[PDB]
Amino acid sequence: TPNCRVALRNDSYTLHKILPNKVDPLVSLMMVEKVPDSTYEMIGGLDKQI
């Protein structure tokens, strides 16, 4: 696979397992994982821009 990491046995260097989840360092605030902060109706007066 592209950018595929594998689990490598540290003695003899044999492929232990295909590792999933290709490299994503510092993606923390990316994909926020909690949305509900304000709703669609509580804006008011900006209908054309919406």
**Looking at beta carbons only, is 21 or 39 nearer to another protein?**
21
Strand partners, 17: 7
Residue 15 as a binder of another protein (CB under 8 A): the answer is: no
Of 13, 17, 14, the residue nearest 4 (C-alpha): 17
Instruction: Identify each DSSP E strand in the chain by its residue range.
Output: 5-8, 15-19
Q: Residue 39 corresponds to which amino acid? A: T
Using CB under 8 A, count the residues that bind another protein.
Answer: 12
Among 28, 38, 39, 49, binds another protein (CB under 8 A): 28
Catalog residues that contact another protein under the rule CB under 8 A. Answer: 7-9, 11-12, 19-21, 24-25, 27-28
